[PDB]
Enzyme design. Structure first.
Site, mmCIF file in Angstrom:
data_model
loop_
_atom_site.group_PDB
_atom_site.id
_atom_site.type_symbol
_atom_site.label_atom_id
_atom_site.label_comp_id
_atom_site.label_asym_id
_atom_site.label_seq_id
_atom_site.Cartn_x
_atom_site.Cartn_y
_atom_site.Cartn_z
ATOM 1 N N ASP B 290 49.299 -74.071 -5.128
ATOM 2 C CA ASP B 290 50.477 -74.756 -5.657
ATOM 3 C C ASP B 290 51.738 -73.928 -5.445
ATOM 4 O O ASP B 290 52.792 -74.474 -5.100
ATOM 5 C CB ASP B 290 50.288 -75.080 -7.135
ATOM 6 C CG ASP B 290 49.290 -76.191 -7.349
ATOM 7 O OD1 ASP B 290 49.435 -77.242 -6.694
ATOM 8 O OD2 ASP B 290 48.353 -76.004 -8.145
ATOM 9 N N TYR B 374 48.614 -83.242 -11.413
ATOM 10 C CA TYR B 374 48.590 -82.055 -12.260
ATOM 11 C C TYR B 374 49.929 -81.684 -12.849
ATOM 12 O O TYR B 374 50.987 -81.736 -12.220
ATOM 13 C CB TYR B 374 48.167 -80.758 -11.534
ATOM 14 C CG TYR B 374 47.050 -81.004 -10.604
ATOM 15 C CD1 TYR B 374 45.731 -80.792 -11.011
ATOM 16 C CD2 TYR B 374 47.312 -81.455 -9.317
ATOM 17 C CE1 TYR B 374 44.650 -81.025 -10.144
ATOM 18 C CE2 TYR B 374 46.270 -81.705 -8.424
ATOM 19 C CZ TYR B 374 44.929 -81.481 -8.856
ATOM 20 O OH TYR B 374 43.857 -81.711 -8.016
#
Ligand SMILES: [Cu+2]
Ligand SMILES: [Cu+2]
Ligand code: NA
Ligand code: NA
Lengths: 620, 620
Positions: B290, B374
């Site tokens: 990420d 997420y």
């Protein structure tokens, strides 16, 4: 009307009257323990019978007794004389604490030791400590306390800053005899004071802290009925108090739709042990069983609003017995309140355009106790999402010693000449489980690593394995943090909508367990502390991991003797016992008064619900 | 005037102008990363030079460039063309996300797969995911995204409830070619919706929650100066923001008397990886970096008062660059506030009669980011007693798949036919240490058990051992929860009043590290995640544990290549890299939106101070 209501002053006065009329409470008797008994299993017959268990000590040397009394019927149910050389001594009495210092003040050997050190006996405080079981045959069957000395320079002085090392005494508190005085050599008494309210030490107080105001304009979200029954955010429970264990949680349940679903039948901290790791003969005997030997509930603090408990606080004031059977109220001994707990769930979805945030909160039930230099906070937390958590907060003043010239492998230096011996603080949580009812089982869940190869060609797969613990002999388990080991308590007869057994997962902190040599006295007396998890079959009389009488008890009563019965625990009425603790190598920052350190555990739902249980929480 | 101030909109506009005039920002160029460079070591020459590092992508296929610019002097310092087959592709651009779905909508193979499943292409959302490095030779040197499909029944529908399993496509987002469409078989698309705001699913909202009001009548106790310099309760620091790393903490120091004592020079989460453990070819390539591939800072949420951040909140609104060099403000992207934190220290002393209680508080610095399904919260905490803590909060919607008939060893069932593959969320904290200055060392501290025998006759003693890590080759360490393993960062040239080196102790949570087979692509690309602790010698260009260009980079750039230099780390300028993570076996309670779960670490002083640093806290 609830069988789980707190003991009343009227009940305790009735017990006193029943004992006195029965001839069991003469002037030589003292009550060392008094507590209400939980209802028996299957008490659905509604036939309430409030019974109390009492340990009665005799200051003249006669055998103590264990007595069970029915306040309902006003009768003695049973009364048994105890052979303490066999089954253990009764818990220490508050009034025996002062006896140690007073008896030593007139002992010629003690006075000679103090004279050699130029210490005024009027300034010498003696910490009265439990004795354990070691090599001294004359102690078998006698009530012994051991004493360590500290100098108080003036009435408001912190004596802990001035340990008198190299000196220990043993005292028979019934015959009032000093059995042994051991003096291994003169150590300088550390001279710096440790007075944390003295401006000389603190400096000018900070003026930079602005107030934080926590209020509840519409009052709290929980209700209290029947004195101690709590309803909060679908949770339902009863808050008990016992002079040995402290706060006990009963009948923890969760309202899921129109079903009240049980989770835990009884939750308590059933023992706690503080073993010291200094091999000096002055302290190598030192192990506190704060729960079993001292009874942590009787030293609960009165908690002050705005200082100990901040916010909209609802107090309980539990009633206990004094040594003579008189009721004594612990005013504001239990704090209950709800707390904001940050974000509960949050998602901003690009495709749907919906932005969603909900806030968490927790219900807090807490008490604080003080045993000598140590202060412990016991905190139970209930969260919106079904999580249950326990946290112990350790603070107070560290136990001190001299710091030896040339250093130590077993003692930290805190100030010039001042040491703090290494030690642990270990708790045992007893969780009488009732996941959707009483047919429960425990599985151990480990992560499983998989090797690259056929069916896992890119080497990315991983899995988990669950092993059912089927009998008590295989239910003594150790942590394995590296494999992410947890334990699941499930009900094989109650399934969620995916046809899986409902369950809760225990998450441990995986701290070290008891460090002492397995052949030591403390390893035998605190066997529970050598392993992280034990599972037993429920039985009425298996209440404590160390047995009923811990004080000066040799070994052979608690968890190792229970599990030898090797009972079926696969889909049965079971009890989980979790060991967890802090290993304390004291730091300079712990002196002269220690910032809080914490340890605990938590349980989270694991397919207990059919979906998230917090979808009906509003947007705030 | 501070060199650590946040980037301004004016600085970013100047960078854009400098690039454009230099010929480096034509219509085919996109900025994939833009960030300010920290000052060089020993910048005490006061000669300020605000420099920015820029990654420039070319949508026509020309080689990208890395460019460093001085806004101070208005010049390009350097500009290097990148060979991405060698050193890695640039981070994913926000504008490439939509390209995947649009390109697939006209591909005959994709349409045939959707037709076989009776799915309207207008209803099919495609999650654009990073590609990694696997067996496909044609991908070397091309920018590839992989796509997985989800059905949205209507515009406000949660597509995550309707995965289209058995189907994956790979897309070249520069040439705009669909390279491969893989269809391994038809799975039923799960039919239940997951709309957590639909009253049909939530039921009537609770009316039982009463408000909790947190206010600060005199305002907060911290001050903010120079835009981002914080002073609070003896702490001093600068809050930075970088589009890749997010919130970065600079110059963490503590005012001890009249000395400002440094502790941490730079603290950040320098990488985070989410590897999936499902061996199905539809998902066995799935690993999110990420931070390194997507840049978590650019997707920071705007945080709402009373909902995301509760209390007296002070916001920062960091400025970043868009793809064209225009400044873009993230309004209310960082929350800062102080929080009550319970009891700090407490003792009731029988001998002195003094009863003492003080309350704790913490300073909170936080941001939230959203990447697809997420959502992650990043929280930094500073406590009164000198403790520093980081906490990550994971929530959002779990990534889903079909649940196969006959079950799975690698996927959890969440709803009828609906699965959630096992995965981890692993973070790397980069802590550029400066304990009392830059001459630091790391020791590993283990508990030591001792055997009963001479000098330990009662078998109660225990101890500890400390091992100095002297060179990088021996500074790759693993957790050992069973031996209570911690790491101490000390300054051997700065001693406390007891003549011991001052230090801070790192307490890890001891969660499992990367589970993948060591020979896997993800183990090679995320080597940092296979070990709990790494120590390197500081160097300007060693910023990330995975290297500068993570996207589609084969391996051979980050921590394993740094430590091969085997540099002296015993009393030198060092950097600690701590790996920590959550292993997620999804539960029914995680659906349809997941309650927060947390992981983190903390650092506590270890003889850094000469006594407790909170003796001057007032009684409240
Ligand atoms: Cu301690
Ligand atoms: Cu997850
Ligand atoms: Na049970
Ligand atoms: Na450093």
């Amino acid at each position: 009307a609830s069988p789980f209501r707190l003991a009343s002053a009227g009940e305790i006065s009735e017990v006193q009257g029943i004992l006195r009329t029965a001839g069991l409470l003469g002037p030589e008797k003292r009550i060392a323990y008094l507590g209400v008994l939980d209802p028996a299993r299957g008490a659905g017959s509604e036939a309430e019978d409030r019974r109390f268990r009492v340990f009665i000590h005799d200051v003249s040397g006669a055998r103590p007794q264990e007595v069970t009394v029915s306040v309902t019927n006003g009768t003695v149910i049973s009364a048994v004389e105890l052979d303490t050389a066999a089954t253990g001594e009764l818990p220490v009495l508050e009034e025996e604490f002062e006896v140690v210092e007073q008896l030593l003040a007139t002992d010629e050997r003690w006075l000679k030791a103090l004279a050699a050190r130029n210490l005024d006996v009027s300034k010498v405080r003696v910490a009265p400590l439990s004795a354990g079981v070691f090599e001294y045959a004359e102690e078998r069957g006698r009530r012994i306390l051991r004493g360590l000395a500290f100098v108080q320079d003036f009435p408001e002085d912190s004596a802990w800053a001035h340990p008198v090392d190299g000196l220990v005494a043993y005292v028979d508190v019934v015959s009032k005899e000093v059995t042994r005085v051991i003096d291994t050599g003169v150590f300088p008494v550390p001279a710096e004071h440790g007075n944390y309210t003295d401006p000389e030490l603190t400096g000018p107080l900070r003026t930079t802290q602005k107030p934080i105001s926590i209020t509840q304009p519409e009052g709290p979200s929980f209700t209290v009925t029947g004195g101690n029954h709590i309803e909060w955010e679908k949770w339902s429970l009863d808050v008990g108090f016992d002079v040995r264990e402290g706060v006990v949680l009963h009948n923890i349940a969760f309202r899921d739709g129109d079903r009240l679903r049980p989770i835990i039948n009884r939750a308590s901290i059933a023992e706690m042990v503080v073993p010291y790791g200094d091999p000096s003969p002055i302290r190598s005997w030192q192990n506190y069983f704060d729960t079993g030997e001292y009874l942590v509930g009787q030293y609960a603090n009165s908690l002050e609003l705005g200082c100990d408990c901040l916010g909209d606080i609802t107090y309980l004031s539990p009633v206990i017995s004094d040594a003579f059977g008189n009721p004594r109220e612990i005013r504001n001994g239990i704090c209950m309140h709800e707390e904001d707990w940050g974000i509960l769930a949050k998602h901003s979805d690009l495709w749907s355009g919906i932005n969603y945030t909900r806030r968490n909160r927790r219900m807090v039930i807490s008490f604080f106790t003080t045993i000598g230099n140590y202060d412990y906070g016991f905190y139970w937390y209930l969260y919106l999402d079904g999580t249950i958590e326990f946290e112990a907060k350790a603070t107070g003043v560290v136990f001190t010693s001299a710091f030896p010239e040339g250093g130590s492998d077993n003692i930290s230096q805190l100030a010039p000449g001042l040491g703090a011996p290494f030690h642990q603080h270990i708790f045992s949580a007893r969780l009488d489980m009732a996941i959707d009812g009483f047919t429960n089982r425990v599985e151990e869940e480990d992560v499983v690593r998989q090797t690259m190869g056929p069916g896992n060609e890119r080497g990315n797969a991983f899995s988990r394995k669950r092993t059912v613990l089927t009998r008590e002999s295989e239910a003594v388990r150790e942590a394995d943090a590296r494999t992410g080991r947890t334990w699941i308590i499930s009900n094989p007869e109650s399934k969620n909508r995916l046809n899986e057994p409902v369950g809760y997962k225990l998450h441990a902190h995986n701290q070290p367990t008891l460090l002492a040599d397995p052949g030591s006295s403390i390893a035998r007396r605190a066997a529970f502390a050598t392993k992280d998890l034990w599972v037993t079959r429920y039985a009425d009389d298996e209440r404590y991991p160390t047995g009923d009488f811990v004080n000066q008890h040799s070994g052979g009563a608690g968890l190792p003797s229970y599990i030898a019965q090797d009972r079926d625990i696969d889909g049965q009425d079971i009890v989980v016992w979790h060991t967890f603790g802090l290993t304390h190598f004291p730091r300079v920052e712990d002196w002269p008064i220690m910032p809080v350190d914490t340890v605990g555990f938590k349980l989270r739902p694991e397919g207990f619900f059919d979906r998230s249980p917090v979808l009906d929480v509003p947007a705030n």
